[PDB]
Design a protein around this nucleic acid. Structure first.
Ligand code: ADP
Ligand code: ADP
Ligand code: ZN
Ligand code: ZN
Lengths: 420, 636
DNA sequence: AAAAAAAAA
């Protein structure tokens, strides 16, 4: 009734049956053949159960087995476990662009403009030495066409072990990963995932000019499974409560004692104002910016962390924050990277230790609040970027205490206009 | 020998037939008066009368022709059916305009696609299919010629073999038609017989909008060809329309020349004749055919239209243009009439003249605005940035090393030795809007008064010397020392700027705030009304488009001076020099020849505003009044 | 990888 093509399959339920545990063990030994015959069986089972036959002949069927065995780490991988199913947990380090993979060749007899399709296997292609048309039958008239073939999307993922496997301050190890089709782009940088797949080994070409091969084989894992690590009616019931303001203000900071007014202000600025861009006058700022000052005995960083994690979008930084052209590390190319302030579009940008802000970056803030659009002109790139972000900062007075007699300006050491 | 007839791809012939059919007889109607347009026939007429080579086809106009039996058939297998479309286009053109062929590379660009894809959604199943993508261009390359159709000479018999189609490698022929010869030797390329085409490679990446979290942006390589070169400048967000292709590694392929990444595991393919024992890899690249971006008075009169004639004639023939004109500048702000008039005069500008021996005369107006905090001084800056073309907004303290004028940057042990352009350099032929003038530093503080008067910037550092053009019209704002303007003192006493900088400016405006109960209520009411009630319903006498039309019409006039104008001007200059020098010695020095030149420039600008080729001494009197009230203010 | 010269903070 859905039209999709996807099956989930747990091993423990597969293990609960006495005949199936034999199939369990045989799946452990021979993954590829078992998976292929299982997919063929499901392809037959669809038709066996529907007894529209038109949507079936277009789609394929695949399984996604999981929980076959306990998760193993890169620190214990014997060569005895080659071509067997294992489960891994780890953190994604880096991804790669989609790699086209040859599946069907397309040749053409240039003399007679005749084309034929040739299948391949194991990557190696058996080139035909003569055109099939015996009317011409020339041997050297066959030429490959690159852009009229069929391809598959291969992608390589780099994975690192979880830090819990290193008890004595050793360094983590990295294992390469491979994915196909629906598994492409399913993980990004910093993602914590668990995968299920078979093990593999491959020879190294060494010198590309000759046919010499190294005595050591590189190891990589091919996977078939990944996992990560009407409510509006309830809103209006709460929205009709008279004292919702006080409860909502006090809910943000459960451990903070008193300080009710600042909590109300922070909640209200989290709510945010309106934004309008009428043509004849120009846009008006809708962001709210708040500054906190006091001696370092107020737990004012706890409120910063509270607002950072509560808000949908927001970056928590300290005293670089904007876009700058960078030289890519692993690949020798030039990439434009956006800063922390740009990343907080529509959210709350949290700044800690605002006094030690240097001098070059402060003017940047003087540019980002009054116009909410930062421009850059470096390396031949001239452009303007939108920020539209809210600022919430904390500052400390100069000295062990803030003397009430002295006015605020001297103690914080900030420019009068920026405070204004 | 056998001469076997080639296979006829009838599908290509059928799609070509349908293509030429809806090319010849589209026959769409645009408006009521446009009964039959024949838009593509008119396009061919345009190529006749202007010698053009590219044609533009709308996808929507193609969409309703034969439904998906033709539109989808072309879009999906675009590479498959491209030569058939080329043949059909050549057939119809040589049916309707043989002399246009004088044999030439016709190009077709499809536009207005239903949807656009993100870079992260690019997948291999769409190879050879028409597509549209968007991103930020970050780098381009030089416009290099590209071999398209090569002609070859068989050296031992000097026979001619031509029309050899090329591929991703430089290909020589494989046979010689001469019966006595058998092409044992290779060929010599005939450069003067081959035909080349333009080629430029650009790089694009995902916008900051699409990219999630802190991951790195995805990059792609786009190749342009034909008339679409230099159309995507770095830093611009653009939309590309073209066909997905794939490029192999030519290094493994046979060539006359000599031959993250270390982990390998690439999809290598081996087993061919020419590869030997080498493996072939591939990479995704995009081919583009259409690029668009989403981010003399007689010449002006040539752009003729009913509104162009009527509106401009009405504006010229009116009697109270000036009275209305100043009322139409920055309708959002409240009050400050003279600041509006001054900004209008700055935006008109003055005539630029050069002497007979090569001495340049400054032809621009510089204006400074001084006032106590919060009296709506940055609003004028923002409005003039948003209205005046080629304008740049800049803060007084610049975070970059370029600062205001320029700077020299070199790579560590790198042979760059290149300059970077400051805001003044970018603002060429435009208006530079610096804010918070007070806290400039010494280098900029001494470079500005050379950039202003002489309109050039000169530098000589670390083996590179240059003289950059900085023809700009500056407008600046500042705040008095101590926060509030002290009426007791003068401009020099309150401001911290140096005396030479003050002489550079041509006009000054001082605006103050007060605690009067009658003014602040009106100010608050006007702010509230624009905020909620009439956020779009302001009442300016003239619209922005009319303002721009009149400004561009008035900019095409160069006023002159008459005898009475010269006599009145010299009398006024003598009076202004005399009366100020009567005050005190060694304490008042503010009038130089620059003031006379400023009078001339302001009179020329006022004459331009009224669209008069001559100058009346009333304009001189008005300019003198402005410059004198610039000194009335410093007294009060 | 390590020494030495130049512009900007
Ligand atoms: N009212 C309070 N309630 C709970 N904890 C507090 C309170 N005041 C101070 N603290 C404790 O004292 C510390 C104050 O540190 P803080 O001033 O936030 O450092 P910073 O210099 O980063 O602002 C907090 O870590 C908090 O645990
Ligand atoms: N129509 C108006 N009349 C008077 N003041 C205005 C008007 N519109 C905006 N303003 C105020 O003028 C200020 C413009 O900033 P600016 O004049 O540079 O003062 P500051 O130097 O303190 O930023 C804005 O903060 C705004 O509140
Ligand atoms: Zn053949
Ligand atoms: Zn020959």
């Amino acid at each position: 009734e859905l039209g999709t093509s996807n099956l989930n399959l747990d091993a423990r339920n597969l293990l609960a049956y006495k005949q199936t545990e034999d199939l369990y063990h045989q799946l452990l030994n021979y993954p590829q053949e078992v998976i292929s015959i299982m997919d063929q069986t499901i392809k037959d089972c669809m038709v066996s159960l529907i007894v529209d036959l038109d949507e079936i002949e277009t789609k394929f069927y695949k399984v996604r087995p999981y929980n076959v065995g306990s998760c193993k780490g890169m620190r214990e991988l014997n060569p005895n476990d080659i071509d067997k199913l294992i489960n891994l947990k780890g953190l994604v380090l880096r991804s790669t662009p989609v790699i086209p993979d040859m599946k069907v060749a397309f040749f053409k007899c240039n003399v007679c403009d005749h084309t034929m399709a040739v299948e391949i296997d194991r990557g190696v292609i058996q080139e035909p030495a003569r055109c099939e048309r015996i009317d011409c039958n020339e041997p050297n008239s066959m030429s490959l066409i690159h852009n009229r073939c069929s391809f598959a999307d291969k992608q390589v993922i780099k994975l690192q072990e979880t830090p819990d496997f290193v008890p004595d301050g050793q360094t983590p190890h990295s294992i390469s990963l491979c994915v196909y089709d629906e598994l492409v782009d399913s993980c990004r940088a910093g993602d914590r995932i668990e995968v299920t797949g078979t093990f593999r080994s491959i020879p190294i070409r060494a010198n590309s000019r000759q046919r010499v091969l190294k005595s050591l084989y590189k190891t990589y894992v091919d996977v078939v499974h990944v996992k990560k690590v009407q409510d509006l009616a309830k809103i209006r019931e709460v929205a009709a409560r008279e004292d919702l303001y006080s409860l909502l203000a006090r809910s943000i900071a459960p451990s903070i004692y008193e300080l009710e007014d600042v909590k109300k202000g922070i909640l209200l600025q989290l709510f945010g104002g309106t934004n309008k861009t009428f043509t004849k006058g120009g846009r008006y700022r809708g962001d709210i910016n708040i500054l906190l000052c006091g001696d370092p005995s107020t737990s004012k960083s706890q409120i910063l962390q509270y607002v950072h994690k509560i808000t949908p979008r927001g970056v928590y930084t300290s005293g670089g924050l904007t876009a700058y052209i960078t030289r890519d590390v692993d690949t020798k190319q030039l990439v434009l990277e956006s800063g922390a302030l740009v990343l907080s579009d529509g959210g709350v940008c949290c700044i800690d230790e605002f006094d030690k802000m240097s001098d070059s970056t402060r003017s940047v803030l003087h540019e980002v609040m009054e116009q909410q659009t930062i421009s850059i002109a470096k390396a031949g790139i001239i452009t303007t970027l939108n920020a539209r972000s809210s600022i919430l900062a904390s500052a400390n007075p100069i000295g062990s205490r803030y003397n009430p007699n002295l006015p605020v300006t001297e103690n914080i050491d900030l420019p009068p206009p920026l405070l204004s | 020998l056998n001469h076997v007839k080639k296979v006829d791809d009838v599908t290509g012939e059928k799609v070509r037939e349908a293509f030429e059919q809806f090319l010849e007889d589209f026959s769409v109607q645009s408006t009521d008066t446009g009964e039959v347009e024949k838009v593509y026939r008119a396009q061919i007429e345009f190529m006749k009368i202007y010698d053009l080579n590219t044609i533009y086809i709308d996808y929507q106009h193609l969409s309703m022709r034969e439904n998906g039996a033709l539109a989808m058939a072309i879009s999906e297998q675009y590479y498959r059916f491209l030569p058939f479309l080329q043949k059909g286009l050549r057939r119809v053109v040589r049916k309707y305009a043989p002399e246009l062929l004088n044999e030439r590379v016709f190009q077709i660009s499809f536009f207005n696609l239903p949807t656009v894809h993100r870079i992260r959604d690019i997948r291999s199943e769409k190879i050879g299919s028409l597509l549209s993508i968007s991103g930020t261009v970050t780098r381009t390359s030089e416009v290099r010629p590209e071999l398209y159709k090569a002609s070859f000479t068989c050296d031992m018999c000097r026979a001619i073999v031509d029309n050899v189609e090329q591929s991703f490698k430089y290909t020589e022929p494989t046979f010689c038609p001469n019966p006595s010869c058998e092409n044992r030797a290779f060929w010599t390329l005939n450069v003067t017989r081959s035909r080349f085409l333009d080629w430029q490679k650009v790089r694009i990446q995902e916008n900051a909008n699409e990219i999630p979290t802190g991951s790195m942006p995805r990059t792609l390589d786009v190749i342009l060809r034909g008339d679409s070169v230099e159309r995507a400048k770095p830093g611009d967000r653009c939309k590309f329309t073209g066909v997905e292709i794939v490029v192999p590694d030519v290094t493994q392929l046979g060539l006359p020349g000599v031959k993250k990444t270390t982990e390998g595991l690439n999809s290598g393919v081996t087993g061919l004749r020419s590869l030997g024992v080498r493996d072939l890899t591939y990479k995704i690249s995009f081919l583009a055919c259409h690029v668009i971006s989403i981010g003399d008075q007689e010449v002006f009169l040539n752009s003729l239209s009913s509104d162009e004639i009527n509106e401009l004639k009405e504006m010229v023939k009116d009697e109270h243009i000036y009275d209305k004109l100043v009322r139409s500048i920055a309708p959002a702000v409240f009050g400050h009439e003279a600041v509006k008039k001054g900004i209008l005069l700055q935006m008109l500008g003055g005539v630029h003249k050069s002497t007979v021996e090569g001495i340049k005369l400054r032809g621009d107006i510089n204006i400074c605005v001084v006032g106590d905090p919060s009296t709506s001084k940055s609003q004028f800056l923002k409005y003039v940035v948003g209205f005046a073309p080629r304008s740049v907004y800049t803060s007084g303290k610049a975070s970059s090393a370029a600062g205001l004028t320029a700077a020299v940057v070199r790579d560590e042990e790198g042979g760059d030795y290149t300059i970077e352009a400051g805001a003044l350099m970018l603002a060429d032929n435009g208006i530079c809007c610096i804010d918070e003038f007070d806290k400039m530093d010494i280098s900029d503080q001494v470079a500005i008064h050379e950039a202003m008067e002489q309109q050039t910037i000169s530098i000589a550092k670390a083996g590179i010397h240059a003289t950059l053009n900085a023809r700009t019209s500056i407008l600046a704002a500042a705040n008095p020392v101590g926060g509030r303007y002290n009426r007791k003192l003068s401009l020099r006493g309150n401001l911290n700027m140096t005396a030479p900088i003050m002489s550079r400016f041509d006009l000054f405006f001082v605006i103050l705030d007060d605690c009067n109960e009658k003014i602040d209520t009106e100010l608050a009411s006007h702010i509230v009304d624009l905020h909620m009630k009439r956020d779009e319903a302001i009442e300016p006498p003239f619209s922005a488009e009319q303002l721009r039309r009149y400004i561009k019409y008035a900019r095409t006039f160069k006023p002159i001076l008459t005898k009475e104008a010269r006599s009145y001007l010299v009398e006024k200059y003598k009076e202004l020099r005399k009366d100020d020098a009567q005050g005190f010695s060694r304490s008042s020095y503010r009038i130089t020849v620059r003031q006379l030149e400023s009078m001339i420039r302001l009179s020329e600008a006022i004459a331009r505003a009224n669209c008069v080729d001559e100058i009346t001494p009333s304009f001189i009197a008005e300019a003198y009044d402005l410059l004198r009230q610039s000194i009335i203010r410093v007294d009060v």
